[PDB]
Design a protein around this ligand. Structure first.
Ligand code: NGA
Ligand code: NGA
Ligand code: NGA
Ligand code: NGA
Ligand code: NGA
Ligand code: NGA
Ligand code: NGA
Lengths: 131, 131, 131, 131, 136, 131, 133
């Protein structure tokens, strides 16, 4: 498995970053958003055999689409909300709902990163960058 | 032969699952429907050389299309109702009837899984996943 | 040479089968038709270098189209009535006559296998199946 | 050089056959026509580097278009009337004349084989069959 | 392996991308980059690294960098898209982004001045990376 | 270099032939025309690296297009009138004039062989045949 | 080790690119280049180097050069696009640029005169790099 940073190509310096909870980067349920690139453990990810992006902050922390379309790290499971695949420079969630849309990883403003309907995902270019 | 789980890509957590008959998963004629993924043996399957999906619940149990379009596990034979092939993420039965239609493995509501005429199969995406 | 059964994809359970004559399945001139699949000696065939389908029932027995379009096993010779080729899942005779048509291995009714002019051959899908 | 029989696909049992003259199959000028296939030497042919079809009846016997469009075996020379090429199942002579036409090996009635203008050659399908 | 190249214009009969430096010193961080006639010295040799940065051979840790005013400098190497470059045929394209919905191309904007320019206006923007033997 | 006869496919027996001058096949300026095929040295040719067809009649004799479009053998030089290339069964001269047409080796009547404008070259099929 | 080629026209039955030189001296810098019948002497032999220059065998350091007025000379070798050449099929195309926004092609412009000509006017512009060795 390749350890990578997930660096935005829609912003001059933003990487996908485990904010954590109250300084604690290792906590289950910790928030994920954007930050200037520095490649510390909370910015390194690995894509496993189940299409989950595992964080290097600790064991058993997977990038997770939440109901409100925000991002956290959570214990790894089988949910499609934890599955990801690439199409060119688009990073797409396998998450499904009644809206008949694919959801793309996308900068929604400032350092906020969420998933956004494909048609409306305007800052959704990423590069998996080998550490 | 590769042992796989058959996970839905049309539902955020559904796998093809041997319910059995009265809690007994090994019974011939036991029901097959959907359930959340946990990869126990009643959710593991193997596609043999005769295009049958063998269940790991016990020997000689093949995924079978019934006349009412529901699914069971039965003793393995030559019937087309036990034969399956992939097209992309669609899992297609070789079963024929008087409808000039192919039948696709499909979620028809809740955790109910059946085969549905191709034109009407709108929750019929699956991913075979190595165990 | 691959030894196969010839199973219909147009009928849920029918294989090309040597019936024989009066119980005797080794006799030249023995009848060929449809039966449920069991893979026993009288359902096993092999396509030779001369495009003949040889039967496992005895040496020197070839699948043969007759005048009236029924099928028998006969001694192997050079006649086009004994030559067969595949186009996708269609199995076609090289037999010629004055009727401006190709003849396809086909099911008419439910139990009777014969060859049929192509344009009327509505249940003519087959699968050569190893073992 | 691969030796073949030249079997018709427009007739259920006809091969190109050196008749000879008065029982002698080896004689120069000997007639060529059709016969049921038996694969003896007077039905075996080889395409040489000059595109001549050499008969196995004897040395130096090539399939030759005569001025009346009948066929004989003759001593091998450079004339286009001895040159042949395939195009699908059509076997075409390089013979030229003022008729703006290609001449195809063709059954013209019964066991008579001649070459015929392409737009009128109705029984002109052949298959070279390896021995 | 990183190839040492000159970046020669195909839109001007004799212009290479060149570290001007400052005050005669070609090694300074923040030194200007523009065009000059080709001579292939170290301040004209470049190498594309695994992070898509064009490193100058003039000194360690000098990367071709798009500035806010679209001029070019060499700067200490980091992660910013302003230092990332990719080829499409003979166009050398910056990964720099802003609100103008455009790609920026390496472009001669007049005389020996080289900047990046919006794609639809980049008329002297053809380049050839040319393998250059480097003397130690 | 591969020695060939240049045999016509537009005439049942014609090969490109060095006639010579006064019975002498070796003379520079000797005429080239057609003749029945016998494969003696005045009918054997070799295409060299300069695209010249060298005759085996004698050293330093190349097939040459003359201003009047007749053919000779001449001392080998650099002129395009001595260069030839194949497209399919057409043999084309590199010869140029102000008419902006390509010239093809062509039978123009009986055993007369010349070069002819491409559009009008109707007996211009050739086969380079290995000796 | 550059392959020895002549640059022979396919638009004229016998014309090669040829260093005329000056007053019989084929080695001189700024020597004129035009056409002549093909004889393969060193003033007609060329080599394409790694910088896309056609070097003449008349002397060290002599490259085929497009001049401002579109005539051709041999000159000391340098980096100028005016000395760079590439092939597309039987067209030999210069990298020279100017204000006209055209590619320039090696072209016969009358008798033995060879220049470069704008692409869409170049009617005697077919060439074959012909191997000598
Ligand atoms: C080096 C490091 O961990 N820095 C983190 C940063 O990546 C980001 O997560 C931020 C969120 O507020 O907090 C910082 O402490
Ligand atoms: C771990 C396990 O076997 N769980 C099964 C489940 O897969 C499903 O078959 C369900 C049907 O009602 O019954 C459960 O007991
Ligand atoms: C089990 C078995 O072999 N059954 C054969 C069947 O294949 C078919 O040929 C039939 C025709 O009457 O005869 C049976 O004896
Ligand atoms: C076995 C054999 O060679 N049979 C030949 C047959 O091929 C055919 O040429 C025929 C002509 O009338 O004569 C037979 O003797
Ligand atoms: C030999 C050399 O380095 N020449 C440089 C040139 O490359 C360019 O940078 C110029 C900037 O004004 O200064 C010159 O001194
Ligand atoms: C064997 C031989 O060389 N025969 C030549 C023939 O090929 C042709 O050139 C003819 C023209 O008149 O003259 C003959 O003498
Ligand atoms: C054999 C030889 O070198 N002849 C040259 C010719 O190549 C050409 O350069 C010409 C220009 O006027 O001058 C001649 O002296």
């Amino acid at each position: 498995m390749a350890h990578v940073t997930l660096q935005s190509l829609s912003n001059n310096d933003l990487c996908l970053d485990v904010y954590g909870e109250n300084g604690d980067k290792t906590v289950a349920g910790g928030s994920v958003n954007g930050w200037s690139c520095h490649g510390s453990w909370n910015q390194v990810w690995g894509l496993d055999k189940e299409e989950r992006y595992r964080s290097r902050v600790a064991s058993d922390r997977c990038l997770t689409v939440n109901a409100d379309k925000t991002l956290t790290v959570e214990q790894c499971g089988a949910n499609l909300a934890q599955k990801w695949y690439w199409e060119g420079d688009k990073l797409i969630s396998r998450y499904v709902d009644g809206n008949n849309t694919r959801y793309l990883l996308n900068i929604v403003g400032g350092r906020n990163v969420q998933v956004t309907p494909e048609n409306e995902a305007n800052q959704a270019r990423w590069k998996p960058t080998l550490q």
